[model samples]
Target chain A: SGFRKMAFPSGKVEGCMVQVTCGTTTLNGLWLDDVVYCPRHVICTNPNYEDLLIRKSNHNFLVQAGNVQLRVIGHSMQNCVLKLKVDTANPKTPKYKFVRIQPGQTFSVLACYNGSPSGVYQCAMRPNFTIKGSFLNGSCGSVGFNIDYDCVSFCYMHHMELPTGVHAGTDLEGNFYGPFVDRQTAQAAGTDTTITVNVLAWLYAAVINGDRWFLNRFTTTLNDFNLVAMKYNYEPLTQDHVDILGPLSAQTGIAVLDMCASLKELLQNGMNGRTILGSALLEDEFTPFDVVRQCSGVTFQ
Target chain B: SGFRKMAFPSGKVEGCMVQVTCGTTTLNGLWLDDVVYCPRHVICTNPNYEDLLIRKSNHNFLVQAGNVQLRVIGHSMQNCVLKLKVDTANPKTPKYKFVRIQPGQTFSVLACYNGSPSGVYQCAMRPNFTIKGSFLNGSCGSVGFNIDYDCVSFCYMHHMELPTGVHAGTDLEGNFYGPFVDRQTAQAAGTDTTITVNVLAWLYAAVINGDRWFLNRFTTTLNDFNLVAMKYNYEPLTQDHVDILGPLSAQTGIAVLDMCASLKELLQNGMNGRTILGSALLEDEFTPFDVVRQCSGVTFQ
Candidate 1:
């Protein structure tokens, strides 16, 4: 069937074109994986990538994930229509979040839907009102796509921003006892924008290197550090994190006040931290307009 | 006349006994400062402490400044009447946010009023259901009292729990420049429970001390710190904060990637953050019923 109508249990249907071929006639049906297929609906909980296709029914579009961020950029030619249908309502019912955008105006939504009933979205403009740009999905949606470790490559990518930043050597061989070499190295070698090896990596490396200083730093800046990290969109701390405190736990040497002092250094001392949106910068409120505008793309609408 | 009724433009009147002793007798009135004062009303935006005294009139009360923590403990004495009138509404029509609290149930409203007319309030139980505690007014309402800098003194005041944690020292008096002195010191000198100092205090000290390291740490952990702090009832972060940033942007020596590395450790490292309610523990979701019950002195009727 080149063009046929697709229907949902809710009695909603739309006309669209798709390839339908003869089937094995099992149970009197004409179904195939690639042609006119309705075998099983796709479902995903996490964000992922996939191509777009109309379900040929009402507004039922197949999705590869639970929540999808849709970006609609208005073109100079004409205003546009952006509609998202989520399954927040009844499984058979479709909920809509619609917005119309004008030139220079961009709209983004982190639309969510229930597992069943696809999350359907549509974008268009008046016949003469054309559009430009493509939608990003899956890993493509992340700001820092696959840029981890590989310190040199990281600096090269963000060189414009963190011009003088350096990486504290890896924690591959550091430890908890004394060998404070890594700590010493970062302090002396680190410039303004230094990325110390990952705090955890440093801890791990410190253990290998026979130095508890790195571990000491972790204990020092726990609250302030994570607050900064989470503001930048990092995960919540783990149990092992809390474990870093008790005596027999990590080591009982670092003074709580002294640990507090080390945290200040850890944050500033050229230790590369985490990044979410395209930039490694923490989410700031009063930055100049241009800086705030840079991440406006994925910033919450 | 020793006793008279004071009237507001809104036609609200309260019968009270006061000395009409000495007044210019202007506008056909005899009033003086000490005898019976009805001067311009006082207004304040923050929550503080004060005492209350009925002015022997309807909805009119005199106030005295005294730090009072209002713990309106509800009791099961009887089905009683609890009335409150605050100037938050029209002066003529006394606004009421009234309710009756039963045994085990508690009712608390950070009631506020405009300085004009009068920020007067009155509460009492009708009939035989006598009450025990005195309510607080002015700026007397705060979750955490006057304790600002006691890492140990702070938690002792709130023993419900988050226990101990540590901090490293120096913006660089001891680097990866400041010595390992701060780290080694904290390990042994630290307490089983600690506060590691306030973020704002640390930030101010860093700037005044020219320790860009502390300032940098402030920048890195700014958001997370604020969130946890706010969660625990601290003030919000403002723009003056970013001013501490842009100018001293981290140098370009450390790979931005390396900075990202430290962030993970920053989050998971065990540093007791902040909390608003009873416990600082973040989990215990479904425990809402029991947890809320713990603070529910006014058992719901």
Candidate 2:
């Protein structure tokens, strides 16, 4: 009821022409009234009209031709016919062709094709093709097959939602999705994650746990040792270790390893590597290293 | 044998006043040759001549006056006299008076007086009176006393040589020496030095000493507790602790307390106060807190 006349230049009926183009594989139509003509399997044609009419209703071959020419007089246009192709290549699983219409144009087709043949296709004119809408089967013609018109428009949007170790890619039908997880995910999930080490937390735990001899030898050998390798050789860092030490590291901007190294040096050598208070004080009776040994269950004689 | 002519302004001797001033309590001298005169307890006088001489020898009284004037016509003037004061207030232990001479002059006296009576007084003139020389008990006159001339000149030199807990001052005799030890020395010696600390080393020793419960509670209560008081409550930091932790603090510029606090945060909350790895890993079977409990022989239920 709200249809508007197509904008076309005024001209004498005999010389004027009308043209139609289709996005899908095929389109077919015919002409009548003073030019009773039709071209089967039509490719292109031009037609002039004073008054014209085209219509399609339930399972009717209204104009199943490719090209036509005609002139109409004193007639009211009622309906139009639009023919769309069907993928009969896989006859057992027939599918409708996809269609995309430009701005200022309308379409009547599905957005994503499922196994259906009796759905409607409708679209409103838009300023640009960014907005997406769906169409149902059988909206274009009674030869029903499901189809999608502009579904791939927001394909790259999937890239923004990927997780830390995941990536994005398309499916067999060109729809965007993710969990094409990358090598980072694999590496993180495998030995790398299992072999985590938070150096300071480990040392702290060891000391608090009274593992003095271990810490003493470890710290003393740090200059000549591979910390990461040594950590792997002993124990992997636990979640608790990371949790306890992580905040301190973040707040202090000191790495866990650096804290460990600092503790190590302190244990091996005295403050500033010198005698601060002298040996006369009773406090001087025990060294920090020995303290660690005694307190942490050291067994070395 | 090395005496040189005095560098007085050259002029006719008749008008030139030969003035003498003594640094000590008294000066007695006399003039010989054409102006043969003497003044007892002399203050000031003047005399001149074509040639003049002055000398001091033994205990004999020569020209004893405040000023001396003389003329020698081809005759060698041999002897002069100088008398110094003696403190007779303490008669049984008499002390020679202290004396200081200006540049371009010489003194025949004592710098610090010990009891004596016989001493010879001799001096050599130089650019300035910075050099110090001592007089023997019999070096000045027959009156014997041990003395140091220009001794007080280097009094402040003692300042540069004081130890960490000692200071400098002068004696009643104005001799510069030290152990005038200041309030810093006293404070250090009394309470401050006794209540000393090396924070990091102390913590290290505590952890190693298998005092897990103490550390656990200490670190957990750090934010609300006074570290120093808590330390004092348990045990004082020994020289050994300071020695061990001093080097670490020196190297890292991280104070011992900071290290302790860092450990506290780590122990109480875990790394970053959050779980780093999930509870799935077996490493997460025991928390760092629980490890300290089990390994350090924690007694809590």
Candidate 3:
């Protein structure tokens, strides 16, 4: 499992790093230049967290998976990530640790947890009890607790699988996990159908029924994005006036972003895009036996 | 001295963002959150380095410093950042720890331990004992032991405030501390001073009683640097390299990143720069002070 420092660029993956310290452990293509027999102690050092700045800017990285160079792209807009790297060759090198990230974007504090050995690392959030901490300091813009408190919380909370975010989708577009549109055949033909307005009742619907139903006749702008993400990017992050935003995107770069602002203007005037896409699957569509009616209880004219 | 979750951004100019925890015991902010203080086990959550990459691109960070802000740009270039609008009013709102790095630069697994704290932290790096570690994993890089091992070696070693490599003009970049020429003086004189020759002789003079006075003809970079620096950054990092890492910034980026590299090239090497600089400092005008030459009978001319 051990290889020479030359095998990898930094000898570590993720923002974290460590030394085997088994001394006589054979290193690939080379031997450990120094003598090692046990774990050595070193006081925590105060290194600059500047490089972490570019973490979200470019979501590109390289890793050696089974002797093959692997490049991962297409990260999620709201997924959690742990960046890591190691410095086996240089003992005096600063092991970098970035934090709180999604793919294909930029932010402060790149890579998290410095580094760790693979095979399911389950831990709780706590203060700086070990090396590879400082994310709780707020410099990285973490919410809730300070650097120490947050880490402690993580020790108790992060033990779950891969934190609370998954990488996928565009910066601000589409249902990352395809919103299941429950379609009901309207009278098996073109007949009227009674559809219960329950798009929120889907298995993976992020929200619940009727809580945020503006999208039915609503027009989602091109720039609809996670407002939180916008705030940090300094790209005119909006204040939360309403709950949950609808996003739009094309193959182009940030096509949806521009549309959001303009869409807001149109939205204030009361307009929805559903008219163009037709109506939702009526409840009666599945059971033609049920009568279809409007909100006023009138038959579909 | 154990101020919890201190926020420091402007370095010393801006006072650290520190807190004194409250409860039945003391002041405020010091008693870290997410900690379980039972009669048998006491757990405190502090920074495991400094940043935590919670989501894919987003991050969770806590700043215990002055003016510090969490940002993520790129893999060696952090061009983007997400600055969280902190809710300074709420105490238990995960404020310091709740800055919410958001979906961009998450990759931090970090923490901090009061080096002065007693208990297991004392024997942390002594091997056998789990010195405990925390870190920030970003979304910028790879996986494997590369990053994990980084802290155990690199970050810890630099704690000694030691440069990675040093060469004496006499010893050809010797590890021994001295044998330096005054670069400033040489530069001021508008002449290439024989710094290398003189420094080397100085180092030799210290050990061999000036027998190898020729070393004096060459000065060392270490000698020059040492004279200028009041002290190096150290946390009792031992003479061995094993104790030289982790106790500092966990790198989420590549290990051995070159500070002077171009935007296109990460891991920009400083060895070439250092070499040229070293050679520049010891150009033509340098000579092994007449005393040095007399004892060793060596001449650069």
Best by lDDT: 2
- Position A31, candidate 2: lDDT: 21
Per-residue CA lDDT of model 2 for B65-157, tens digit only, reads: 213322212222212222222111111121223333322232222211111111112222122212122222111111111122212121111
Question: How do the residues B124-215 of candidate 1 rate in per-residue lDDT, one tens digit apiece?
Answer: 11111121111122211101101111110100000010111111111101111012231113322222111112223222222222223311
Report the first chain's TM-score for all candidates: 0.20, 0.17, 0.18
- What is residue B15's positional error in candidate 2, in angstroms? 51
Ten-residue stretch with the least lDDT total in model 3 chain B = B115-124
TM-score of 3: 0.15
Task: Mark the regions of model 3 whose C-alpha exceeds 4 Å error after superposition.
Answer: A1-301, B1-301
Reference-based TM-score, model 1: 0.18
Ranking under TM-score, best-scoring first? 1, 3, 2
| Reference-based lDDT, each prediction | 0.20, 0.24, 0.18
Residue A64 of model 3, lDDT score? 26
Best by TM-score: 1
Instruction: List DockQ, one per candidate, in order.
Output: 0.01, 0.00, 0.01
What lDDT does candidate 3 reach at residue B273? 23
